[PDB]
Amino acid sequence: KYQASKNRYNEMKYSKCGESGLKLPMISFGLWHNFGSNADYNNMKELCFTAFDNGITHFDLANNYGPVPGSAEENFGRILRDDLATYRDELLISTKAGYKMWEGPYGDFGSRKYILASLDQSLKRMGLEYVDIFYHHRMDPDTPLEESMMALDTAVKSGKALYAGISNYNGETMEKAAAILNELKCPFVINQNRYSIFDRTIENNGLKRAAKENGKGIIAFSPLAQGTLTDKYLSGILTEKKLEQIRRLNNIALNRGQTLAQMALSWVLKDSEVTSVLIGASKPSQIIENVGIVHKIGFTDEELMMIDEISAN
Ligand SMILES: NC(=O)C1=CN([C@@H]2O[C@H](COP(=O)(O)OP(=O)(O)OC[C@H]3O[C@@H](n4cnc5c(N)ncnc54)[C@H](OP(=O)(O)O)[C@@H]3O)[C@@H](O)[C@H]2O)C=CC1
């Protein structure tokens, strides 16, 4: 019954993952929220269909997305089986292991045991032969980096992942990971990190610069900073200081013909080293509003120095 829009590649822009021939849509769709046990199945399908119809080819999951850890993967597995499997070779599907998935010493952090056992569970829940990208979800300083990276390499060499990625790494540790995956001859093309007007962590921990200097992509998540970079906290007449930052940023957005959310998405994409911005949605209208932003990623030196002075604590 679902037939992907014939116009789905007409507007979206696609960007190389650093030096790689792998291209992400400039807007990627994440299943962190609204795909869990309590989610409505018809709404989840419509969100996926809306995403793909607008040229979003990348669906981002993790083992523990729900809630109930694994529910998002199982739900996406059902959407694939029922309607999207037809288009599987047009989709990039990711999953991850590295945060808490199940109880006990093998269900969190980083070991080869957890990472590989988790990937098998993810493939079973999603009904896939492989994921396009398999990520180490966060750094584990208590496991040798060589062990976690060799686990990603085993995933790729076992035909269970096309490419390796890492998430939440700093610049120094990303460099070490890149060196290990290079020596293992394991495709490694993408970093997934939190980035917004209100979260400059990757500008200060070396990740944004290390990714660019080593030809690795970046996919930015939480670009709307927990609803603070949306209309949610705006009036038409939650510290007083935060509401003021939001009021002034929204004025910069209005002058650009954008909502605050739209400008927040455009800002994360302003620099070429950021490959894609990862959005969420509860309703299709949010996808449709957000996909216009890929066409306004340019900012004047004035807009930028104002956004920085306003966002500065
Ligand atoms: N450690 C990691 O690697 C992590 C990665 N991620 C990835 O990033 C993805 C996105 O993260 P998330 O924080 O949800 O992303 P965003 O910062 O894009 O927030 C998404 C939410 O913002 C609201 N929203 C979206 N578009 C609009 C709009 N145009 N106007 C107003 N409100 C809007 C909706 O919430 P509502 O309708 O309820 O207001 C939506 O559910 C996740 O799904 C996941 O794939 C995220 C977290 C951790």
Q: Residue 45's domain is classified under what CATH number?
A: 3.20.20.100
DSSP string over 269-294:
TSSTT--EEEE--SSHHHHHHHGGGG
**249-250-254 Cα angle (round to 5):** 125
193 CB less than 6 Å from ligand 1? no
Query: 212: domain range?
Result: 14-313
- What's the total number of domains in the chain? 1
261 CB less than 6 Å from ligand 1? yes
Contact indicator for 225, 195 with CB cutoff of 8 Å: no
Cα(202) to centroid of ligand 1, in Å?
A: 18
123 falls within a domain: yes
21 is an annotated ligand-binding site residue: no
254 falls within a domain: yes
297 CB less than 6 Å from ligand 1? no
Residue 168, phi-psi category: left (phi > 0), alpha (psi -120 to 50), beta (remainder)? left
232 falls within a domain: yes
* Cα–Cα distance measured from residue 73 to residue 31, given in angstroms and rounded to the nearest whole number: 8
3 falls within a domain: no
Helix pair 41-53, 71-79: axis angle to 10 deg: 60
206 falls within a domain: yes
Question: What resolution, expressed in A, was reported for this entry?
Answer: 1.8
60 is an annotated ligand-binding site residue: yes
> Which residue puts its alpha carbon closest to atom 27 of ligand 1?
286
192 is an annotated ligand-binding site residue: yes
106 falls within a domain: yes
4 falls within a domain: no
List Cβ neighbours of 287 (8 Å cut-off, separation of 6 or more). Answer: 29, 47, 50, 51, 54, 56, 279, 281
* Cα–Cα distance measured from residue 234 to residue 250, given in angstroms and rounded to the nearest whole number: 9
307 falls within a domain: yes
* Cα–Cα distance measured from residue 208 to residue 253, given in angstroms and rounded to the nearest whole number: 24
Of the candidates 121, 120, 155, the one whose C-alpha atom is nearest the C-alpha of residue 136 is 155
Q: What are phi and psi of 213, to 5 degrees?
A: -65, -25
280 is an annotated ligand-binding site residue: yes
Mutate to test the pocket of ligand 1, among 24, 31, 32, 109 (most ligand atoms within 8 A of CB): 32
Indicate if the alpha-carbon torsion angle 119, 124, 129, 132 is positive or negative.
negative
